Design a protein around this ligand. Structure first.
Ligand SMILES: */C=C\C(=O)Nc1cc(N(C)C)n2nc(C)cc2n1
Length: 301
């Protein structure tokens, strides 16, 4: 059948970490000190609020399952869980937040090199998930986090499944392949569609796709053959890559491995593929922080 999943689920003591502040509302920014290791690891802590919903607890542990099973530089993984009244997911702190929020906040200071490198990094993440026969089903700029402006990771495995037929929920219509909206079919190729929309969000500095169009309309518009428009900064080269991600024949869309290749070629000469005003000028980056270690340098056998 399939290869056994020997990934380790690490159970942490609540005393091993301190919650430093609140990020969203519930996610906290904290520090994790592994028991007798003398390192401090900046962490994001996702703690279930209600904790009285058994349905809810089956949703966060599915996420923990997936995040524990992934190890790639462009995919966020799970450091461990804490089994207090409330289940807490402990993950690498991604200090600069979601790429969606970051392109909105910094539109004026983001050059072609960064945008195309992000497209490459997200293509590697998605290629790695595909190697692991994993379909994300919620790729969007909101679900890509920024460790540094040089370094992004795909997150939110809330809807991730393996290799897919589903039956309801509140769904991201505007990011979904046609076969997904109509027939609840999802493949690596449906993920490529959503990659397409994710790239469009970055190239429009975080514009809402099909802004002010009702979700009930979306399925019809796409059958009528309409797609999101060419963003201003986008050479036809870059936009043609987005448009191929939105072909009706799922096998006619590019493979993540090909998206890596194409965007790498373009990242080698960024000003030839994205036209941005003032591109050349663009510039971006407790008590004892001595024993701080980013999760990426904190490895376990
Ligand atoms: C790389 C693991 C990860 O996903 N960390 C993470 C998660 C979240 N969530 C789930 C909201 N984060 N929010 C912020 C601001 C950082 C952050 N990091």
């Amino acid at each position: 059948g399939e290869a056994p999943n020997q990934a380790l689920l690490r159970i942490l003591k609540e005393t091993e970490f301190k919650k430093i502040k609140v990020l969203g509302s519930t996610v906290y920014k904290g520090l994790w000190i592994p028991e007798g290791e003398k390192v401090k690891i900046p962490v994001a802590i996702k703690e279930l609020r209600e904790a009285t919903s058994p349905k809810a607890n089956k949703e966060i542990l599915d996420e923990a399952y997936v995040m524990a099973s992934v190890d790639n530089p462009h995919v966020c993984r799970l450091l461990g869980i804490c089994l207090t009244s409330t289940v807490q997911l402990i993950m690498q702190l991604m200090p600069f937040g979601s790429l969606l929020d970051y392109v909105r906040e910094h539109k004026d200071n983001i050059g072609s090199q960064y945008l195309l490198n992000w497209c490459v990094q997200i293509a590697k993440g998605m290629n790695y998930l595909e190697d692991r026969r994993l379909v994300h089903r919620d790729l969007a700029a909101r679900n890509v986090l920024v460790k540094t402006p040089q370094h992004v990771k795909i997150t939110d495995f809330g809807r991730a499944k393996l290799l897919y037929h589903a039956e309801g929920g509140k769904v991201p219509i505007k990011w979904m392949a046609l076969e997904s909206i109509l027939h609840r079919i999802y493949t690596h190729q449906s993920d490529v569609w959503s990659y397409g929309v994710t790239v469009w969000e970055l190239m429009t500095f975080g514009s809402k796709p099909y802004d002010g169009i009702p979700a009930s309309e979306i399925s019809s518009i796409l059958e009528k053959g309409e797609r999101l428009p060419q963003p201003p900064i986008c050479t036809i080269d870059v936009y043609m890559i987005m448009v191929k991600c939105w072909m009706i024949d799922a096998d006619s869309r590019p493979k993540f491995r090909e998206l890596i290749i194409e965007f790498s070629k373009m990242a080698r000469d960024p000003q030839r593929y994205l036209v941005i005003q003032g591109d050349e000028r663009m510039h971006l980056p407790e008590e004892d922080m001595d024993d701080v270690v980013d999760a990426d340098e904190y490895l376990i056998p």
